Amino acid sequence: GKALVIVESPAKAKTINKYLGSDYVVKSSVGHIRDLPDERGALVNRMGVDPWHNWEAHYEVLPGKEKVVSELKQLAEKADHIYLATDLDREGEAIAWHLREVIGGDDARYSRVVFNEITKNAIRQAFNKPGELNIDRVNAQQARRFMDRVVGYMVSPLLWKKIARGLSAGRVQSVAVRLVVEREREIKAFVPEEFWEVDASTTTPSGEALALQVTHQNDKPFRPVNKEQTQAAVSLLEKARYSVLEREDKPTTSKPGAPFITSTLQQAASTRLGFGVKKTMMMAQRLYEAGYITYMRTDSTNLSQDAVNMVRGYISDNFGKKYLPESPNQYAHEAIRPSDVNVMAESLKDMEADAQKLYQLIWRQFVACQMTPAKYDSTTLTVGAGDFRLKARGRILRFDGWTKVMPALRKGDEDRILPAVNKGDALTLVELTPAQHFTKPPARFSEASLVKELEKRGIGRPSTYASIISTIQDRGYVRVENRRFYAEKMGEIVTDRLEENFRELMNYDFTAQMENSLDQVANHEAEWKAVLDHFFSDFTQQLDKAEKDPEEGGMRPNQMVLT
Ligand SMILES: Cc1cn([C@H]2C[C@H](O)[C@@H](COP(=O)(O)O)O2)c(=O)[nH]c1=O
Ligand SMILES: Cc1cn([C@H]2C[C@H](OP(=O)(O)O)[C@@H](CO)O2)c(=O)[nH]c1=O
């Protein structure tokens, strides 16, 4: 009679139900339903996957989920068709697969609808032409879960034996920790170096103040390394005659950033709002499931024609023609953007204050990215003083452009304003001011700028950045203090062990290559079991070698021997 539609959560069921007619009956599975718990039955059972019997698995219904299973089956018989409207990512394809497996029935009974936002039009087109479940994406998702399970359950026991009980190892988690350990060690080994700068405050012919910075001496960059050198330079500069060597006036511009993707969202939310990766991703999700923003797991800065056309109309009505570019800006699935540009952060219904703030950030970035650039009149004055050359920078805002959508400025607005001076003009020295500085050590990773580092290295993945970040934290390898990452001693002890006995597993390129391999499975360019066999072959040669006595090249035990 009617159609059954399955989503993964109550919040999502409610939202999507506003856009589905009486023919459809929405029901949230309210969870994952089914999942995982030279052989050794012992291991296979705990893992729920069997590397020695072509990877057959044993999925089991979750606790208290039996009522849900049975509640779906009967609803399935009273429906003519079944639509799996899980989220568009691989994990979402696997969950759909599990629902289809559990409920059973002809495959023709099922359809897999895809949408990256829950709006009337997005839902309409999603159920207009519903595609089929994609087994390749499912295999790509399970291949990941399998190798993750293998490393965790087969490396961890070795760590208990060799280092300490309760420790964990993670295919990617251990690589993420490595980045933190290397960073921790760069910092511990840094030797701050001394270097000086010299500023000069002068007077234009009119008498207006002009501040300068010494740049060259004898046509060579100026950078003394001690107090004596600066003084010698200072004595020459006190007697020198100053004059404007050259004035270069040129117009500059600044462009709006591209619309957000998972990683950039996390960084900006962390840098501007002080939100950790977990917080940002939990609010993003609720915004998404409430129908306010597009899917929050993406690495595409692409924007649909309608989205661009709706925002351009908003820019045009609320800001004006000079803020609208000739043609739309194209940045090279969709970015994270509001679903309706006319819905303001302040109009959100059941969203807490911070969730509204995240929406605001997303909204502003989206509107800004389709606006014209800001224009500035930049000025660069070069000054000569004996064998010295000095500099003064400054710019004037000519047209705010995209920055009009961002809060009003209030600080060093018009970063420095230079007075009226022409080439050949004479400046009067009023005061010299030398200053001592010291090179700083590399910044400590932040939850977000680590995702950034993970992204740059092709190690992360929109759907895993969050988990990775939190999954390496309560295991005693690294900790977040003052919003920063600190490597624990145990994080170093384990990292060296792994690098020594599991080189390939800890290598950055190989870890990145595995993501490619996973994309290949998803795109029918590689078969999942063969990819897992190869992975396992490489893994077990590493493992057996590590298992041996250290005098055979096995893993070093965490000990300190007697006299
Ligand atoms: C300049 C810079 C900032 N950040 C960050 C992380 C935080 O989001 C923010 C600083 O916040 P914090 O002072 O609370 O640590 O800027 C980096 O991660 N790397 C950098 O190089
Ligand atoms: C869930 C998931 C998605 N993705 C990527 C690949 C997916 O495209 P394909 O699965 O390549 O369509 C896309 C789903 O949003 O994001 C990953 O790389 N890893 C994951 O674990």
Side-chain angles (χ1 to χ4, degrees):
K2 291 143 56 186
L4 172 57
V5 179
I6 304 178
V7 291
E8 51 273 78
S9 77
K12 189 176 165 177
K14 186 235 289 75
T15 313
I16 192 173
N17 199 52
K18 285 187 299 195
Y19 312 117
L20 292 179
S22 45
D23 324 62
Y24 303 98
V25 175
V26 189
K27 187 46 162 286
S28 65
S29 64
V30 190
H32 292 301
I33 297 299
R34 193 174 72 157
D35 206 313
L36 290 175
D38 315 66
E39 304 82 62
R40 179 78 229 95
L43 234 184
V44 173
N45 291 189
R46 301 193 288 280
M47 299 201 289
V49 74
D50 195 341
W52 297 280
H53 297 70
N54 213 207
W55 311 92
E56 81 174 68
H58 182 54
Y59 304 107
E60 313 171 358
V61 61
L62 302 183
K65 279 288 163 292
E66 202 52 61
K67 301 191 301 173
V68 185
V69 175
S70 46
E71 192 169 57
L72 290 177
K73 280 173 164 292
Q74 60 180 181
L75 293 179
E77 64 175 298
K78 293 189 302 176
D80 285 321
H81 203 60
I82 307 165
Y83 297 74
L84 311 180
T86 51
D87 290 335
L88 65 73
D89 77 338
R90 299 182 187 175
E91 160 172 282
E93 196 78 22
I95 283 165
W97 177 70
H98 281 109
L99 290 170
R100 120 99 105 62
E101 292 306 88
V102 169
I103 303 179
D106 305 303
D107 297 333
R109 288 269 291 166
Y110 300 100
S111 288
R112 194 278 193 265
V113 296
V114 183
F115 49 76
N116 48 51
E117 81 183 324
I118 306 178
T119 64
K120 184 187 299 299
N121 279 63
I123 288 302
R124 177 183 295 148
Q125 281 99 59
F127 284 74
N128 173 66
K129 20 173 288 180
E132 303 305 312
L133 188 70
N134 187 332
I135 198 65
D136 294 319
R137 299 190 74 226
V138 170
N139 293 334
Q141 172 67 193
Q142 301 311 271
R144 178 190 295 290
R145 292 292 302 280
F146 290 11
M147 41 182 99
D148 270 9
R149 177 58 58 105
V150 162
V151 174
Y153 287 53
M154 287 185 71
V155 171
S156 289
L158 176 57
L159 289 186
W160 303 336
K161 158 60 180 55
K162 300 281 192 154
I163 295 71
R165 257 67 224 313
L167 298 174
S168 287
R171 193 170 65 72
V172 177
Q173 298 91 307
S174 295
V175 184
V177 170
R178 178 180 168 171
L179 288 168
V180 180
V181 165
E182 300 182 325
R183 176 48 59 61
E184 191 70 37
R185 282 171 167 163
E186 276 169 31
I187 294 180
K188 203 58 182 286
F190 193 64
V191 177
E193 302 179 304
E194 189 188 311
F195 76 100
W196 297 68
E197 281 174 41
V198 168
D199 288 36
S201 50
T202 65
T203 276
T204 63
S206 69
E208 303 194 78
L210 176 60
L212 299 169
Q213 163 109 67
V214 180
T215 66
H216 304 64
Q217 170 170 34
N218 293 139
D219 297 292
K220 297 279 200 169
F222 183 70
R223 195 169 187 294
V225 297
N226 57 242
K227 183 172 293 180
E228 298 79 68
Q229 310 193 327
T230 306
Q231 226 263 45
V234 163
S235 295
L236 296 178
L237 287 166
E238 290 205 71
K239 302 168 185 170
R241 200 62 75 179
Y242 297 66
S243 66
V244 178
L245 245 207
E246 140 181 48
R247 172 159 189 157
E248 191 175 70
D249 225 293
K250 56 175 296 184
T252 56
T253 71
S254 64
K255 311 175 175 192
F260 291 132
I261 54 171
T262 304
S263 54
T264 47
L265 176 60
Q266 292 177 9
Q267 176 73 323
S270 177
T271 295
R272 305 187 185 302
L273 306 184
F275 297 165
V277 166
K278 189 180 292 187
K279 182 165 174 67
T280 294
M281 296 311 295
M282 282 182 83
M283 303 194 289
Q285 201 200 321
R286 273 188 288 118
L287 282 168
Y288 159 67
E289 303 197 327
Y292 299 140
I293 64 168
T294 43
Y295 194 47
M296 65 290 150
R297 288 179 176 179
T298 170
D299 57 41
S300 169
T301 52
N302 171 265
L303 300 176
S304 73
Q305 193 201 299
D306 291 318
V308 168
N309 291 343
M310 83 165 134
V311 68
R312 285 173 65 76
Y314 184 96
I315 292 170
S316 182
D317 297 344
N318 300 302
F319 293 119
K321 192 61 212 57
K322 51 286 198 59
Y323 292 87
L324 195 71
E326 201 211 323
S327 305
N329 283 329
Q330 236 304 307
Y331 300 87
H333 293 171
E334 269 192 282
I336 299 178
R337 63 175 174 64
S339 284
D340 187 317
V341 300
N342 296 302
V343 169
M344 299 300 116
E346 304 85 7
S347 302
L348 300 191
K349 308 214 74 59
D350 80 84
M351 297 293 131
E352 66 281 22
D354 291 332
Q356 288 173 42
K357 276 179 173 62
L358 184 61
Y359 179 81
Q360 183 173 60
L361 181 65
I362 294 172
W363 183 92
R364 313 216 269 213
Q365 192 71 26
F366 172 59
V367 175
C369 84
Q370 286 313 315
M371 294 173 76
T372 53
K375 302 167 71 52
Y376 304 76
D377 282 312
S378 292
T379 304
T380 293
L381 293 176
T382 299
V383 172
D387 291 317
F388 289 91
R389 205 190 310 170
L390 296 82
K391 219 80 154 300
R393 292 270 12 186
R395 69 173 183 180
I396 303 303
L397 181 55
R398 194 251 240 67
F399 173 62
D400 54 23
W402 68 277
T403 71
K404 179 58 165 181
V405 220
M406 303 297 173
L409 295 63
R410 201 301 144 59
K411 55 170 184 180
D413 186 299
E414 300 302 299
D415 55 68
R416 234 292 199 57
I417 261 50
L418 311 177
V421 282
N422 305 150
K423 173 179 177 177
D425 285 342
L427 306 178
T428 298
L429 183 72
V430 180
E431 185 62 52
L432 284 169
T433 306
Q436 174 173 49
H437 301 93
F438 43 90
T439 63
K440 312 297 171 53
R444 287 178 167 290
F445 278 119
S446 113
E447 281 189 356
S449 70
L450 172 56
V451 173
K452 183 183 175 192
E453 179 64 30
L454 286 175
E455 172 181 62
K456 186 208 287 177
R457 294 184 181 265
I459 297 312
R461 228 60 192 189
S463 57
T464 71
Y465 297 133
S467 66
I468 296 182
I469 262 59
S470 66
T471 197
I472 63 179
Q473 242 172 289
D474 305 288
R475 295 179 167 179
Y477 299 141
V478 298
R479 75 158 189 291
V480 177
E481 186 195 9
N482 202 49
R483 298 235 308 141
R484 253 46 177 167
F485 267 121
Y486 285 82
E488 322 260 62
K489 316 65 200 162
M490 189 47 83
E492 305 191 326
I493 291 166
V494 173
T495 294
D496 295 332
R497 264 59 169 190
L498 297 180
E499 299 197 323
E500 280 163 30
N501 288 287
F502 293 86
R503 191 171 190 178
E504 161 157 300
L505 186 156
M506 296 283 291
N507 180 81
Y508 299 126
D509 294 331
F510 271 123
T511 298
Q513 169 59 210
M514 182 58 71
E515 289 298 320
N516 289 188
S517 284
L518 290 177
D519 290 341
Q520 286 161 32
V521 163
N523 283 308
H524 210 247
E525 304 160 340
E527 191 279 307
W528 71 303
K529 293 194 178 193
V531 164
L532 287 169
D533 287 330
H534 180 224
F535 148 77
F536 197 60
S537 175
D538 292 328
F539 176 66
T540 53
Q541 188 178 63
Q542 279 168 287
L543 180 60
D544 302 325
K545 208 179 310 298
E547 250 163 39
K548 300 180 176 306
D549 286 333
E551 34 275 312
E552 302 186 76
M555 184 168 287
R556 290 156 48 222
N558 184 34
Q559 288 167 43
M560 183 70 251
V561 193
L562 225 185
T563 301

